[PDB]
Design a binder for this molecule. Structure first.
Ligand SMILES: O=C(O)Cc1c[nH]c2ccccc12
Ligand SMILES: O=C(O)Cc1c[nH]c2ccccc12
Lengths: 134, 134
């Protein structure tokens, strides 16, 4: 069957299944998917452009702008003059424990594969992103 | 930065970027993303359940049911008595050339990585899907 070994289908299924597991945890901790992606993407980061944030969070830029309107109103992020965006201390403290849980979940996902295969997967994915980003 | 090496973020970005490239081709050939996923998933397949189709096409089941209503009206798929679904000859002929283009695009995406790394990636993704599917 074509779909059994078609790379874009494999990537999309693996991504949806693993992400859906963690999204249940995020919601139980009071986060929507989009708020989790924004805060996790900005944590530990220098300010980045709205367009960079949209790419890394895999969210359309007009959707990101609406999201930032409300997250900035809640004091979790700040836009700065191309517009840059950063997480605030309030946002970092809000997301820090969830980030620890995300690392634990990722470790569980990767444990059956071993360190070599896990690092090879992450390296390949990073190289693909850097080759295909606009 | 957390997000630079967080597996779910890497999978989702790689998946979106590679898929968006092929989706431009699909649209230029008159297909929506959802129609392409359904026909490509059913091509060469025995009939599968609606729930299986929803998982492999990464589409919510109520969305799939609406999609199948219109694709069946156009004679591209058929539902059969758990409901099973298959592609028809009309659907297969409609999607065959696009599938060839999809294989060519996939070959281009994977060529910089070489056969060993490409097969390792596909194997890891398949194993992850089979471990995380419900
Ligand atoms: O939601 C997911 O699991 C996928 C994803 C895409 N971009 C992200 C940025 C930060 C954290 C997770 C994600
Ligand atoms: O649209 C994409 O490229 C991802 C995708 C997810 N499930 C699919 C089934 C068949 C073809 C492509 C896909």
């Amino acid at each position: 069957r074509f779909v059994d070994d078609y790379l874009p289908a494999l990537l999309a299924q693996a991504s949806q299944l693993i992400s859906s597991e963690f999204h249940e945890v995020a919601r139980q901790h009071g986060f929507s998917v989009s708020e989790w992606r924004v805060m996790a993407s900005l944590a530990g980061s220098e300010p980045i452009s709205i367009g960079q944030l949209a790419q890394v969070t895999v969210t359309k830029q007009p959707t990101v702008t609406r999201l930032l309107d409300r997250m900035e109103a809640r004091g979790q992020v700040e836009r700065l003059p191309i517009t840059l965006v950063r997480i605030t201390r309030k946002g970092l403290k809000a997301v820090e424990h969830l980030m620890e849980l995300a690392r634990e979940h990722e470790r569980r996902v990767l444990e059956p594969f071993g360190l070599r295969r896990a690092e090879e997967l992450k390296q390949t994915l990073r190289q693909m992103i850097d080759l295909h980003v606009h």
